[PDB]
Amino acid sequence: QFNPYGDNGGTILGIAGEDFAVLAGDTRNITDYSINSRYEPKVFDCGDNIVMSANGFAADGDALVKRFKNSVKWYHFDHNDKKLSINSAARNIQHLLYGKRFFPYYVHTIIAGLDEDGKGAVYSFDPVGSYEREQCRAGGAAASLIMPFLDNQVNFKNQYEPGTNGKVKKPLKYLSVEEVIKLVRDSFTSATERHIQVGDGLEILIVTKDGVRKEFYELKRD
Amino acid sequence: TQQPIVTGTSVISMKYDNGVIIAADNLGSYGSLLRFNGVERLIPVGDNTVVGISGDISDMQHIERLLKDLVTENAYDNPLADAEEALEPSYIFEYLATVMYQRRSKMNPLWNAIIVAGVQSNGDQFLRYVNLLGVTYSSPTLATGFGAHMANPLLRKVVDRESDIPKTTVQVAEEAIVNAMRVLYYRDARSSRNFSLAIIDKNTGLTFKKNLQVENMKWDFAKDIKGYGTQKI
Amino acid sequence: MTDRYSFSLTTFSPSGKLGQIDYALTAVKQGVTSLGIKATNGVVIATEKKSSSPLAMSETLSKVSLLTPDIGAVYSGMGPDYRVLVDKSRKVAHTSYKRIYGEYPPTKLLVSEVAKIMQEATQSGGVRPFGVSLLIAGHDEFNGFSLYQVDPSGSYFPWKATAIGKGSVAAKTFLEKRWNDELELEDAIHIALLTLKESVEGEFNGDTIELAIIGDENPDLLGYTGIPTDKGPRFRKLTSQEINDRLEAL
Amino acid sequence: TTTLAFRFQGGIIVAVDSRATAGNWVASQTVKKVIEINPFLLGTMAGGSADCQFWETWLGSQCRLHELREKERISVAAASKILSNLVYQYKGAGLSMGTMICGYTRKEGPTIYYVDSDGTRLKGDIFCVGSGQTFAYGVLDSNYKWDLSVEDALYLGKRSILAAAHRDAYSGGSVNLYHVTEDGWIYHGNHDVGELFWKVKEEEGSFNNVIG
Amino acid sequence: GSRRYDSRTTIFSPEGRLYQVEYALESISHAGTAIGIMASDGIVLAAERKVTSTLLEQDTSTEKLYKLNDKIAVAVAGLTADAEILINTARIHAQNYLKTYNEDIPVEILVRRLSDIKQGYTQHGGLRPFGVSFIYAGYDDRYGYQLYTSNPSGNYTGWKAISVGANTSAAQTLLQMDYKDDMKVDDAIELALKTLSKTTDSSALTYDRLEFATIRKGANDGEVYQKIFKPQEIKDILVKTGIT
Amino acid sequence: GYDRALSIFSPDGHIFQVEYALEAVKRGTCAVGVKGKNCVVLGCERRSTLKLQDTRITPSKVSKIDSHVVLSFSGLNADSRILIEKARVEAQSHRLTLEDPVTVEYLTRYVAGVQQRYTQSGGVRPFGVSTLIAGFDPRDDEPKLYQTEPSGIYSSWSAQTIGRNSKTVREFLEKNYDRKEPPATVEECVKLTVRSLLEVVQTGAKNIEITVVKPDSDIVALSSEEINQYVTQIEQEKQE
Amino acid sequence: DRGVSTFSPEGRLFQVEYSLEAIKLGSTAIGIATKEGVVLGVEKRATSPLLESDSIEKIVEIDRHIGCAMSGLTADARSMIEHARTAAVTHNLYYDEDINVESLTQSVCDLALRFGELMSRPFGVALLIAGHDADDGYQLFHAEPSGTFYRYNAKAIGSGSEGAQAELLNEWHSSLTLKEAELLVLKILKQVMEEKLDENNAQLSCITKQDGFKIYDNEKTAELIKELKEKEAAE
Amino acid sequence: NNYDGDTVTFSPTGRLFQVEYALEAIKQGSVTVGLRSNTHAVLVALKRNADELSSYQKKIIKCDEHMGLSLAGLAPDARVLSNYLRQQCNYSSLVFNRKLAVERAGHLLCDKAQKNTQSYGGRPYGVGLLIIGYDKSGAHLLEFQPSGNVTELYGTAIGARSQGAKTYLERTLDTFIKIDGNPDELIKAGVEAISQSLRDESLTVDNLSIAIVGKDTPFTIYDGEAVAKYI
Ligand SMILES: *[B]([O])([O])[C]([C][C]([C])[C])[N]C(=O)[C]([C]C1=[C][C]=[C][C]=[C]1)[N]C(=O)C1=[C]N=[C][C]=N1
Ligand SMILES: [Mg+2]
């Protein structure tokens, strides 16, 4: 019997800062126990200061990103070159995904950018289109390894202030772009060590009011 | 949904400093029966692209006709069909990739794994993969089926990352490909000794080599091997 | 393309006339004379084989046609329109009756089906009415022998005897004097030949006259033996010789 | 999931949890399981996240179109039936929903409809829906009265979700409270279970089984 | 294109009349007269065949009176072929109703259905209307004995006594004069034949130029019998009433 | 299918087919609607050119669309059946989905919408019918009376008439109907409706039909004798 | 006869030009756009005194931020309004935002030329579409049955249009207040109307960013009419 | 005369009058100019207002990052045709990862317009288009007529009084073709060209509409104070 789905591995990570947002993802592409590519870009600039990644089955991932990029193009044509806000993009993606509710895009989608107040924004989707704005989200193969670390080191969960013994929580102070990139790199270094489908390279896209910047880092190739 | 009947095995390929090399054996298998011994699985498109195909041969022949038809269609009302508006490797690939994914989405796939090797207008090397699922990826070395498991490891020792491409000559690259084909003949039970090889260079163009054979094989050591353990005679 | 004539080409005029039906009847009037006579033990239908050229083989053109083993038809008017009606009539006898009830339709119901086809050409989009009047003779178990006329409008009437086409007015008067309710089939054939001679100009023989009967069952024409209940067709077309024999006793 | 809604003297109380799971994996603790269909209508969400989200924000579009066309607020009966008729068309296809449509109008008063992906549409006073519905039912049925204050009703709903959050492994995170009166719904805050449990335990004297 | 040849059968005149309906009614006015008379104990249907011949087989002939079911019959005035199309549709409608509700179709419901079909041909489709007017004679257990008429417009009305076809103006005046509410079937039979005898364009009214039918509760106990009169039976009733 | 554009604009900006449909309404028997303080009355003319009619079974001029709404009309009778049927279906469809019967305004808006659709659809001619739709909204004691016409426009009326000689009876209603004080009772409302028809009808015998609709699905049709008593009382006051 | 989509020798579609004549026979509708809002006003024109004038609905809400006035064969407008309302709500569903007034107008105008031998004829009604969005602020559009739409600072359509347009030419400036615009619509309506203008035979409405689209009460308009009379008698 | 009732009818001299009447609608439209060098291609369009309260009707539509057109005639027909071009440009990109050639875009418009001239029921398009673009063979300018005829040109003009601008370009041919690597000078030549078609009215800030595409210049439209530089 023909199986229309496959698993291309990989892992992605979105973090929303105070006036910035990052969307990271490893560059390894796989099937079963073989490496297809050590550098296959997974996070894409879609225009209008929005970055996107659809992790899971790469064919469905590429199809979805391609169709969203297309939706941005036609949004400009149909509405006098109006900038597609991140919240509007998110709702649009829900309809793209739910449109194939009974033959789903087998992907975990994450977009990142800035909201209309200039603050950092990350949105997260399931394969059939349910979505929610989030401060933090890891997706894909090693998501289970990364999310708990982010609950602890981004939202200061289960952390309290010394001397008070559980009475006073650690205050939720804001994180700089340099601080976030440190947490992203350590997340992927750790994920690479314990997950076989994570490695080769890490590509991070950073979104600010100035535009979209890229950073690349080597990961272990075993 | 179907099953593949007459099938072709590994297609292997890699980038080098001035272009790309691609190769595939000339066998059309019918299960374990090595039925057809003269099947060409590298199909050139113009003088700048070679499409290597593995998997179902009936579907390969269909794809071959689509590409032939693509050249005809591009020539229509196109005074620059042999110049600025000639078919690019990137155009040919994206077309195939579109078809492969559309067919899988109708639950009626073209049961193949395809590698499009070529050189672009600006001299850039093109090498990208697509299969029955519509999955696509690019890499300095690409291989299908058994080639993925056995050829890639050997070809990645020559070009391990992007920066190794300018350091790799056509002689070193071809040598690596020819060696990989020998290894696949040792170890793939659905391979043949006879194969075809294609080089697409940005300077010397398309060189298509037919009727190549695996040579310099090591078998002599077999004479010393006796029994499966304790047997001496 | 597409048939963009989805509207009626036959419409009521201020006077209440349906023009195309009237004009179709005019075409029937110009057509060669045909007639039908009903006897106690049979029915006869007859017409003239008006050959368009002496080089033409008039035997290949059949004006009198078998519809079922016990039903036959003849016409006056446009031959091609008749030919396609016979094709449709033969088919409808199977599709709307024989494939349902396992037997051939009775005369009146097959006539009803033909009439329906001719009515629809009078109301449907983008078509003209059929330019023929049919005379349908037939037999069935419960109704016995019968003879029907069918007009371009789709209207049909049962007749003891009648004529249509060129010299119908004179021929119907001739039949009124000769017809009675005690005629045997041979007597009806004799009267049919007498009536038809009046409307014919040139040669009058078996080769220029087409004549068929609905009479006794013909087991010799069945084609097989072994089933007692199947006794053969009541429709029989008279041969050129059989006509000439009765022209000597004329 | 644990979601509840109940009619009383002061209108309707709606209370939901916040957890979303994929197997044993906790996918989210911050899910909005209540949707604000308009200033007067609320919908709860249980079962498939996408199905509930998509079709309940769709419901808000249909309700808006109704009051544009009819120059009048849509009834809770009519709104709930639009959703139930829609999902009934998709019956068999595999939609997964358990929802309460909660509202207040002049002609109806406070009204709750349980709507279901099998096509079930039920009017009622009390409903609990989700994997932890049985736990919430225990607290509700023993403490429910018509003559509850808005303050006491709000607490009962909060406490009933807490009860389920504790016992049901697929419920938890936090509690979202809503209070529905004539003049629209009124949000009553997000309450983290990690803090609410220790607060309620201490103040109420309950959960003596657990050590704190 | 094709527009050039379109007669446009479904349009209003400047006066607000439907051309084709009006012309269809003109066609019907030349058809043989049909009369229906409703009594307390039954209904009569009488109709005149159009200029017949001595060679017409009358006993197997039917151009005027048709059976829709065991309880309902119709008299036709207009194109016979058009009428048979509608008659077969009506026969099916009656059977559909019987299959659905397991009860015989009420007369009015059948009449409304056929009338609605006629109406459709005047409003849409670009086809010519049916050049037919019906007299419906029927019985059901709600309203009892009922007479209706419908015409190409698709409009229908109920009657105590009514005529369609030729000379309706003269016929309706004669019926209006001699009709009474407490009338019986035997009296209605006589009235129908006397009316035709005076309005006919023929020299004399004979059995071979008539079709006749009665719907009576003159069936053994609480039930209804349809009687399509045979040629010999029409001849006898003509002698009985003193016309021949 | 037959796609021919029958309703089209003319150089002076008129759709003649729609206007000729109004002429068919002008030909139709007169229909009148009057709303009182707690009721609506629908009066209808019956042309006495047709006697020997069976009034038991003959299609009545006023039709119930639901138990709380009625519809009368002027124009082509056969056309009116199609609108009535559609309206009755929509009335049940509304109860099924909204769980509440139609408002008189909604039902009118639907019927008017159907009539409009037939003025710019290919292959069809407009309805030769104008309607008066009357009744009471569910759980509402305010009387409702609406009018529609072939073009598809509709509007609410304190009192209105349509059909032949409607110009005359509208003249009567415009001077006799006071908005500040409408017919307070059923009697007063019926009397004013009969009076208005008597300006046009001829004989007050079987030529006038009256249907009274009251709140909460209370609809009744008056008999010949009941109407005849109104006819008698009106003329006896007139002899002065 | 002749095609419905036929061109005249001058290069105009016969049917579109004829539908414009029908719009000239329609009741007057006026729109004025300001920086404080857009005002929409219409002549009701009841055919008889027995017709309850408050049932005449020639000003209509499309969304909270978009209103619409009509003139001509007003029955034709119902399907245009239905489409407009659906388009507005649908876009909010797909994009979680208000739709641009221009985009809404464009969507309505796409229906216009969908006629042939689709609907059998063009629409016999013109629309004044007024609204507000964040990108282009307060806007007023004139949507015709030709499929064309122009933006306007002020615009009059219907029987008294060219007389009203000439009056709007003189009176409009870029610093008009909302109150000044309200009176200006009432003034020009009163000028071109056959019958004497009052709160029962004329209707006002506006669209502001804060309160959205509002149809004015007959009591509220009556005061603005009284305010108008006094200020005209003031000189 | 008797042969202008529909598009499916030739006249006795072999003319299609409905097509010619559609051509007439273009001549009533406002003037627009197109011209190109080897590096850039420019559109200049005189926009038309209804009155002083009204806006000026937009004349230029973007089809892709590398292609767009200006219109003259029925604006809704230009919207239909530009929408078709947007889809065809987009199909080329999605399927073949290839920017649509300007010549091939012209061929597609020709064939779409032709079908409306040979079939019953339909009508010809009532608009003329000037398509500019930059593809793999450099800058291009096309002129589309609703008869179906598409023509590649160095420069041209369509609309009312377009003959004046067309003559100017015919004189300036050798000059403006050489304006390479200088967008502002190529626009100046276009603004000077369209000025030969003006009478009574002159180019104001909300009257003028300019568009440009080139080697390293995406198709961009200039309106309002962005064109005050060129007035
Ligand atoms: B609740 O537990 O039913 C919850 C409500 C939903 C609206 C968020 N549903 C889920 O958590 C479901 C799984 C499930 C668990 C128990 C019962 C029924 C269903 N999960 C999701 O819908 C889901 C999971 N991962 C990502 C997105 N959505
Ligand atoms: Mg690893």
Shortest CA gap A20–chain D (Å): 22
> Directed axis angle between helix C185-199 and helix C168-178, to 10°?
150
Cβ(E57)–Cβ(C38) under 8 Å?
A: yes
- Structural domain count, chain B: 1
| Residue type, position G32, single letter | I
Domain spans of chain H, in order of start: 1-231
Taking Cα atoms as reference points, which of F73, F59, F33 lies closest to residue F212?
Answer: F33
Cβ(E205)–Cβ(E52) under 8 Å?
A: no
Report chain A's C-alpha Rg in angstroms: 18
Separation between Cα atoms, residue D41 and residue D30, nearest integer Å: 22
The answer to whether A and C touch (≥3 CB pairs < 8 Å) is no
Specify the CATH number for the domain of residue G235: 3.60.20.10
Q: Are strands D174-181 and E144-150 parallel, antiparallel or unpaired?
A: unpaired
For a pocket test of ligand 1, which of D25, D129, D170 has the largest count of ligand atoms closer than 8 A to its C-beta? D170
From chain E, the residues in CB contact with G2 under 8 A are 3
Token digits of residue A28: 């390894």
- Structural domain count, chain G: 1
D164 contact partners, CB below 8 Å, separation of at least 6: D2, D17, D130, D132, D133, D135, D136, D171
> Directed axis angle between helix E231-240 and helix E185-199, to 10°?
90
Segment 122-181 of chain E within 8 Å of chain C by CB? 126-131
| Residue type, position C33, single letter | T
Segment 86-125 of chain E within 8 Å of chain C by CB? none
Token digits of residue H80: 């239909």
DSSP H87-104: HHHHHHHHHHS-PPPHHH
Q: Which CATH number fits domain H1-231: 3.40.50.300, 3.60.20.10, 3.40.50.150, 2.60.40.1180?
A: 3.60.20.10
B167 contact partners, CB below 8 Å, separation of at least 6: B17
D171 Cα: distance to centroid of ligand 1 (angstroms): 10
Q: Does F9 touch chain C (CB under 8 A)?
A: no
Token digits of residue B7: 């099938």
Give me the residue from B80, B88, B95 closest to H137, CB to CB: B80
Burial of G35 (0-12, 13-18, 19+ CB in 10 A): exposed
Give CA separation, A14 vs A61, A137, A143, A190, in Å: 17, 5, 11, 16
Token digits of residue G85: 């309302």
CA B70 distance to own-chain centroid: 20
**D63, D70, D115, best to mutate vs chain F, most F CBs in 10 Å:** D70
G14 contact partners, CB below 8 Å, separation of at least 6: G2, G6, G7, G8
Q: Look at the alpha carbons of E15, E17, E18, E20 in this order and tell me if their dihedral is positive or negative.
A: negative
Q: Does E63 touch chain C (CB under 8 A)?
A: yes
Residues of D designated as active site: 1
From chain F, the residues in CB contact with E143 under 8 A are 56-57
The answer to whether E and C touch (≥3 CB pairs < 8 Å) is yes
Sheet architecture: strand order including C235-237? C161-164, C34-38, C43-48, C209-214, C235-237
Cβ(H216)–Cβ(H181) under 8 Å?
A: no
Cβ density class D50-61: b for 16+ within 10 Å, e for less: bbbbbbbbebbb
How many CB pairs below 8 A link A and G?
26
Q: If you measure CA to CA, which chain C residue comes closest to E124?
A: C7
Cβ(B174)–Cβ(B200) under 8 Å?
A: no
Cβ(H124)–Cβ(H18) under 8 Å?
A: yes
Specify the CATH number for the domain of residue F66: 3.60.20.10
Angle at G94 between CA G90 and CA G95, to 5 degrees: 115
Shortest CA gap A33–chain B (Å): 9
Token digits of residue B188: 């793939």
Give me the residue from F15, F116, F159 closest to G78, CB to CB: F116
DSSP conformational letter for C153: T
Give me the residue from G97, G102, G136 closest to A88, CB to CB: G97
Q: Does E1 touch chain H (CB under 8 A)?
A: yes
Separation between Cα atoms, residue E158 and residue E148, nearest integer Å: 4
Among all chains, which residue has been given the structure tokens 């995170």?
Answer: D173
Q: If you measure CA to CA, which chain F residue comes closest to C8?
A: F2
Q: Which domain holds residue F123?
A: 1-240
From chain A, the residues in CB contact with G95 under 8 A are 75, 88, 91-92
Show the beta-strand stretches assigned E in F6-156.
31-35, 40-45, 63-64, 69-75, 129-135, 144-148, 154-156
Q: Are strands F208-214 and B194-201 parallel, antiparallel or unpaired?
A: unpaired
D51: helix, strand or coil = helix
Shortest CA gap G94–chain A (Å): 5
Give nearest CA residue, ligand 1 atom 11.
D20
Cβ(E81)–Cβ(C155) under 8 Å?
A: yes
Residues of B designated as active site: 1
Taking Cα atoms as reference points, which of B173, B180, B174, B145 lies closest to residue B159?
Answer: B173
Token digits of residue A147: 């999310």
Instruction: Kindly state the helix (H) or strand (E) to which residue C171 belongs, with its residue range.
Output: helix C168-178
Cβ(E130)–Cβ(E81) under 8 Å?
A: no
Taking Cα atoms as reference points, which of E42, E29, E56, E69 lies closest to residue E201?
Answer: E29
D21 Cα: distance to centroid of ligand 1 (angstroms): 5
CA A160 distance to own-chain centroid: 29
Which chains sit next to B, with 3 or more Cβ pairs under 8 A? A, H
Q: Which domain holds residue B138?
A: 1-233
Angle at B201 between CA B195 and CA B204, to 5 degrees: 105
Cβ(B89)–Cβ(B20) under 8 Å?
A: no
Output the ligand 1 site: residues, CB below 6 A: A 126, 130; D 1, 20-22, 27, 31, 33, 45-49, 52, 130-131, 170
Separation between Cα atoms, residue C237 and residue B86, nearest integer Å: 75
Separation between Cα atoms, residue H143 and residue H148, nearest integer Å: 10
Taking Cα atoms as reference points, which of D66, D62, D116 lies closest to residue D87?
Answer: D116
Give nearest CA residue, ligand 1 atom 7.
D49
Separation between Cα atoms, residue G88 and residue G65, nearest integer Å: 10
A148 Cα: distance to centroid of ligand 1 (angstroms): 19
Task: Provide φ and ψ at H169, rounded to 5°.
Answer: -60, -35
Instruction: List the beta bridge partners of residue H134.
Output: H139
Q: Does G1 touch chain E (CB under 8 A)?
A: yes
Among all chains, which residue has been given the structure tokens 């985009």?
Answer: G103
Compute how many other C-beta atoms are within 10 angstroms of the C-beta atom of residue D187. 11
H176: helix, strand or coil = helix
Q: To the nearest 5 percent, what fractions of chain A are helix, strand and coil?
A: 30, 30, 40
Give CA separation, H228 vs H212, H224, H231, in Å: 16, 7, 5
B96 Cα: distance to centroid of ligand 1 (angstroms): 38
Task: Provide φ and ψ at B159, rounded to 5°.
Answer: -120, 95
Instruction: Kindly state the helix (H) or strand (E) to which residue G119 belongs, with its residue range.
Output: none
From chain F, the residues in CB contact with D85 under 8 A are 97
Taking Cα atoms as reference points, which of B184, B182, B110 lies closest to residue B143?
Answer: B184
F199: helix, strand or coil = coil
Domains, chain E, with CATH or none: 1-244 (3.60.20.10)
Specify the CATH number for the domain of residue B117: 3.60.20.10
D48 Cα: distance to centroid of ligand 1 (angstroms): 5
A191 Cα: distance to centroid of ligand 2 (angstroms): 7
Cβ(E237)–Cβ(E193) under 8 Å?
A: yes
Separation between Cα atoms, residue B120 and residue B86, nearest integer Å: 10
**F93, F97, F98, F102, best to mutate vs chain D, most D CBs in 10 Å:** F98
Cβ(G34)–Cβ(G185) under 8 Å?
A: no
- Structural domain count, chain F: 1
DSSP chain E: -GGGG---SS-B-TTS-BHHHHHHHHHHTTSPPEEEEEETTEEEEEEEPPS--TTB--TT--SSEEESSSSEEEEEEE-HHHHHHHHHHHHHHHHHHHHHHSSPPPHHHHHHHHHHHHHHHHHBSSPPPP-EEEEEEEEETTTEEEEEEE-TT--EEEESEEEESTTHHHHHHHHHHH--TT--HHHHHHHHHHHHHHH-SSSS--GGGEEEEEEES-SSSS--EEEE--HHHHHHHHHHTT--
H174 contact partners, CB below 8 Å, separation of at least 6: none
List the alpha helices (DSSP H) in G65-150. 77-95, 101-112
Among all chains, which residue has been given the structure tokens 């009819």?
Answer: D70
Burial of H228 (0-12, 13-18, 19+ CB in 10 A): exposed
Angle at B202 between CA B200 and CA B205, to 5 degrees: 50
Token digits of residue D71: 């120059």
| H97/B90 touch (CB, cutoff 8 Å), yes or no | yes
B106 contact partners, CB below 8 Å, separation of at least 6: none
Cβ(D165)–Cβ(D193) under 8 Å?
A: yes
Q: If you measure CA to CA, which chain G residue comes closest to D59?
A: G93
> Directed axis angle between helix F104-117 and helix G77-95, to 10°?
110
Which chains sit next to F, with 3 or more Cβ pairs under 8 A? C, D, E, G
Cβ(A96)–Cβ(D54) under 8 Å?
A: no
Separation between Cα atoms, residue B110 and residue B59, nearest integer Å: 6
Give me the residue from A102, A132, A144 closest to D28, CB to CB: A132
Separation between Cα atoms, residue C34 and residue C48, nearest integer Å: 7
D23 contact partners, CB below 8 Å, separation of at least 6: none
Give CA separation, A28 vs A31, B140, D18, D92, in Å: 10, 13, 34, 39
Domains, chain D, with CATH or none: 1-212 (3.60.20.10)
Domain spans of chain A, in order of start: 1-222
Cβ(B65)–Cβ(B48) under 8 Å?
A: no
Cβ(G8)–Cβ(H126) under 8 Å?
A: no
CA dihedral in degrees (A154, A157, A162, A165; nearest 10)? 170
Cβ(C67)–Cβ(C169) under 8 Å?
A: no
Shortest CA gap D180–chain A (Å): 24
Q: Which domain holds residue G176?
A: 1-235
| Residue type, position F116, single letter | Q
H231 contact partners, CB below 8 Å, separation of at least 6: H203, H204, H205, H208
Domains, chain C, with CATH or none: 1-250 (3.60.20.10)
Burial of G229 (0-12, 13-18, 19+ CB in 10 A): exposed
Q: Does G24 touch chain D (CB under 8 A)?
A: no
Cβ density class C127-147: b for 16+ within 10 Å, e for less: bebbbbbbbbbbbbeeeebbb
DSSP conformational letter for G82: H
Task: Provide φ and ψ at G80, rounded to 5°.
Answer: -70, -45
| E126/F25 touch (CB, cutoff 8 Å), yes or no | no
Domain A1-222 carries which CATH code? Answer: 3.60.20.10
Cβ(H121)–Cβ(G5) under 8 Å?
A: yes
The answer to whether F and A touch (≥3 CB pairs < 8 Å) is no
Among all chains, which residue has been given the structure tokens 């068999």?
Answer: D92
Among all chains, which residue has been given the structure tokens 């069976």?
Answer: F54
A189 Cα: distance to centroid of ligand 2 (angstroms): 9
Separation between Cα atoms, residue D42 and residue D46, nearest integer Å: 14
| D82/F97 touch (CB, cutoff 8 Å), yes or no | yes
**A70, A77, A79, A82, best to mutate vs chain H, most H CBs in 10 Å:** A77
**E19, E20, E23, E59, best to mutate vs chain C, most C CBs in 10 Å:** E23
Token digits of residue C139: 């037999």
CA dihedral in degrees (G53, G59, G61, G64; nearest 10)? -110
